[PDB]
Paper text:
MR1 is a highly conserved antigen-presenting molecule that is ubiquitously expressed by all nucleated human cells, with cell surface expression of MR1 being strongly ligand-dependent. MR1 can capture microbially derived metabolites formed during riboflavin biosynthesis, including the most potent mucosal-associated invariant T cell (MAIT) antigen, 5-(2-oxopropylideneamino)-6-D-ribitylaminouracil (5-OP-RU). Several MR1-binding ligands are anchored within the A′ pocket of MR1 by forming a Schiff base covalent bond with the MR1-Lys43 residue, triggering MR1 egress to the cell surface. We describe a range of compounds found in CS that bind to MR1, and we detail the structural basis of their interactions, thereby revealing novel scaffolds that bind within the A′ pocket of MR1.
We used the MAIT A-F7 TCR as a crystallization aid analogous to the use of Fab fragments, as crystallization of MR1 binary structures is typically more challenging. Each of the four CS compounds was clearly visible within the A′ pocket of the MR1 antigen-binding cleft and each formed a Schiff base covalent bond with MR1-Lys43 in the pocket. The aromatic rings of each CS compound adopted a similar plane to that observed for Ac-6-FP; was wedged between MR1-Tyr7, Trp69, Tyr62, and Trp156 of the aromatic cradle of the MR1 pocket; and associated via van der Waals interactions. Each of these ligands was located at the base of the pocket and did not interact with the key MR1-Tyr152 residue. In contrast, all benzaldehyde analogues (salicylaldehyde, veratraldehyde, and 3,4-dihydroxybenzaldehyde) were stabilized inside the MR1 cleft through forming a direct H-bond between their carbonyl group and MR1-Ser24 at the base of the pocket. The 3,4-dihydroxybenzaldehyde ligand formed a stronger network of H-bonds with MR1-Arg9 and Arg94 that resulted in a small displacement (∼1.5 Å) of its ring deeper into the pocket compared with the other CS components. These additional interactions are consistent with the finding that 3,4-dihydroxybenzaldehyde is a relatively stronger cell surface upregulator of MR1 compared with other CS ligands. Notably, these four CS ligands, while making numerous contacts with MR1, did not contact the A-F7 MAIT TCR, suggesting that these ligands would not activate MAIT cells.
Residue numbers in the entry:
A (entry chain H): 1 to 245
B (entry chain A): 0 to 189, 196 to 221, 223 to 270
C (entry chain B): 0 to 97
D (entry chain G): 1 to 200
Amino acid sequence: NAGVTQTPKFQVLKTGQSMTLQCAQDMNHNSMYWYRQDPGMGLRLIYYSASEGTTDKGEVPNGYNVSRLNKREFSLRLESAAPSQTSVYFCASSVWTGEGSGELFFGEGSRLTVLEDLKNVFPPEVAVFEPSEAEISHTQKATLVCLATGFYPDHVELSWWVNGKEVHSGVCTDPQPLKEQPALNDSRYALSSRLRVSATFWQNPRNHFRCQVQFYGLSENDEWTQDRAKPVTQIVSAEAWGRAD
Amino acid sequence: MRTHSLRYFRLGVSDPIHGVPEFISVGYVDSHPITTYDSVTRQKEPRAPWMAENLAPDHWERYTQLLRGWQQMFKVELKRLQRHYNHSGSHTYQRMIGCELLEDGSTTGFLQYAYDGQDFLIFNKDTLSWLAVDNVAHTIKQAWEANQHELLYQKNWLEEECIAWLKRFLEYGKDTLQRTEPPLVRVNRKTALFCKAHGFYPPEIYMTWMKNGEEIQEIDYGDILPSGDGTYQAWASIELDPQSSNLYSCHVEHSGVHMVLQVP
Amino acid sequence: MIQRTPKIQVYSRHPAENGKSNFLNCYVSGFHPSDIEVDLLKNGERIEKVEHSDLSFSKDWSFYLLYYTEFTPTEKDEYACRVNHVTLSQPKIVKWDR
Amino acid sequence: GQNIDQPTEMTATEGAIVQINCTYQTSGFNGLFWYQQHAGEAPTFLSYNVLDGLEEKGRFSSFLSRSKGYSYLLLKELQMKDSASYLCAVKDSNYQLIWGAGTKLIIKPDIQNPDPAVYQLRDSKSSDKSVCLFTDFDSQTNVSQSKDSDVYITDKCVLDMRSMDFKSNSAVAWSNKSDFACANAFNNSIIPEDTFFPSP
Ligand code: NA
């Protein structure tokens, strides 16, 4: 009872590189679909499969192919990736096609960025900044801030870890990254997040705070020729301890 | 404009003979086939030239995909019925949907299903409910009526979408569907009087015998039969009374014209 | 299981006249289920070049078909239509009565 | 051709009522769908209308007028979790979905005790950046981007301390420039008159 499972969640590609997105549904559905979502416009259908054993083109099939492997699986193939195929791809399924009221069930989405060269891919630099003493005395609260800066593309997942456990209460992360150089088209990004706790929780010297950014980047098969380090998929983190005085 | 109708039929066979298809879909505008699909060709194709000439290939490609899906859906529904009937062997499942655009401008809409050629489920788009003929259909009725949105969707398709398609197809085949070919009507003896008409279109015709200006349970009505050239023929007979003289007259109504043939 | 036997009607396209080309029709209707075999007969022999319409559907869920072939009727040659169906123990022949 | 239109963005206050409009011009009509899509997540089905009228479903209601080619999604008693994009889609005569571009619904929290202040966070030993936090201001305050190319300022973010049932807006500014100070970090923004600037 997992619903719709598509992989991978993120992927960087060089122009001309092949790629296959996977999609599976365990709801015994007959119809499956592949969409792309781009800013400023509605979902556009790429290919669909009305039932097992048949597929057809959607609105934007050029540059893609699909295979309805069986009733559960519907893969999307990018043979020669192009910069215009940089998008968020969604696989969906429905019980049938042509039934009027049947809704779609969507997978988590796959974010693809296709680049001419991988020389502008950077992992984030991550830093934690401890609360202001003025805030603690004025509000009896303490706000930690975390900055992930200089990363490209925008394939990151930031999380907070208090005493080894991930937390979400008192946490707010920018929903959209910040272009460090808004004019340039391939600008590296910055992302900020805050964790706010009570002053008493911050003033316990044995409380541990950690910011963690998962970056999705290159893999073993990607060619790297730059003098800097290869920007592979990696976790970059920074920490801070509670301060008594 | 005369009364016109659009209907789509589906036939599903559970264990068909080696050659026979297990699924067949055919659409009609009045008595004319317009489209066809079966599990052998797996393609939706026009069956009238004015349909092929007015619908682009992307229309046939799209409905080919839809019918491949509906084919599988029909097989699943038929498997479910025959298991719940506990029936062995080959059995048939049928669906008919469509609408009528009446002469006065009013509309009708209908949707129903059959198992082994007998009524199974009948949709009432006014009360938004399904009429079940037995407890196998009653089980299906409960599951279909639990999805209120599907009932509303079918009401909208019958009252709005179906009528819109019919008007579109009516213009496409205006030269065929809206023409009038009057009948050629004659009488001969064989002892009974036979009134015979042929060469007419549309097929809707009314023939009857009158005795001394009174219409009579004593008339044998023939079927309206296709002649093979796009026109139709029909007949009606009545037995002669040898013990008394009577005025016999054949009455034929067709496409707003009445005809009377007195038998001398 | 209610199986319905086919109704068979043999007739010419036009009022027949000897020596005038015409079409012999065999209209088979009202049957269920849909499997059926139809042959047009000329003096007890099956006619080879014989056409037929696609299987057709009626509102009461039965099926119908039109089998036809072109012919020139003469006073000597007799024509008929032979139909077989699950509802028939043996083929049923209906002669063309002009 | 086939067109579907909905506003790009809407902003309303927590607890209020918002009506998101969708108009469509399609060849045929087999139903109108509303979907909810949280940022970075999958769309999820909200509602379906095919006949005229209003259909309620919790805090959400969906209305349809076939003759006008128009529908709205009605959200009552707005909560922060309602912040999302809302996508309208119409099934045409051939059962093909036409998708609107989506409406991004932004929700302003109700700040009961505003306490606007700009705080200087503690430097990190592993970073050359100085970081400033503008926090606890009323939801009517807007945070402008920086006019200095070496000063970075993020938009406002709504955080919820669940244990205390407490919400607050905040924005972050940082820079490694020598002249950068939190007293001037948000000078390009219209900030409350009573903003607290603690002494350096
Ligand atoms: Na393609």
